[PDB]
Design a binder for this molecule. Structure first.
Ligand SMILES: CCS(=O)(=O)c1ccc(OC)c(-c2cn(C)c(=O)c3ccc(-c4cnn(C)c4)cc23)c1
Length: 125
């Protein structure tokens, strides 16, 4: 009943490092240590949690484990692809859950930190 996780490696896509991609892995993702990170560190395990509607409602799942692996495997060419995956992750949480739910307050806090760090993205090549 869970879907396979998102793809994290694709040798058919070209690979590069950029200052912004480095910042996304080393500053943004790592800043993973937050109090509230665990529910976002791996795909939502609908089987474990007995949430058979989760993947009926969320058709673009995303999570920080996936993002980290993507950054490590040079999956993204453009930083904005990675930023989009973060934003997807947050939006999923907002769609599935209701305001004032603990998990939503967790996501809001994580997203505020995420946004602060993106406002300090370094210069593009
Ligand atoms: C990601 C590791 S996990 O799948 O075991 C896990 C553990 C705890 C979690 O929240 C406290 C979640 C979780 C993550 N996200 C992103 C959600 O949106 C989410 C929504 C609902 C629930 C949940 C747990 N039990 N129930 C009734 C609902 C649980 C979640 C997921």
């Amino acid at each position: 009943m869970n879907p396979p996780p998102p793809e994290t490696s694709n040798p058919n896509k070209p690979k590069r490092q950029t200052n912004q991609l480095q910042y996304l892995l080393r500053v943004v993702l790592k800043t993973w240590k937050h109090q509230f990170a665990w529910p976002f560190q791996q795909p939502v395990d609908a089987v474990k949690l007995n949430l058979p509607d989760y993947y009926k409602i969320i058709k673009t799942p995303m999570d920080m484990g996936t993002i980290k692996k993507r950054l490590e495997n040079n999956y993204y060419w453009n930083a904005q692809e990675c930023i989009q995956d973060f934003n997807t992750m947050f939006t999923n949480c907002y769609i599935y859950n209701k305001p004032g739910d603990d998990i939503v307050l967790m996501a809001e806090a994580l997203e505020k930190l995420f946004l602060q760090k993106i406002n300090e993205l370094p210069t593009e090549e």
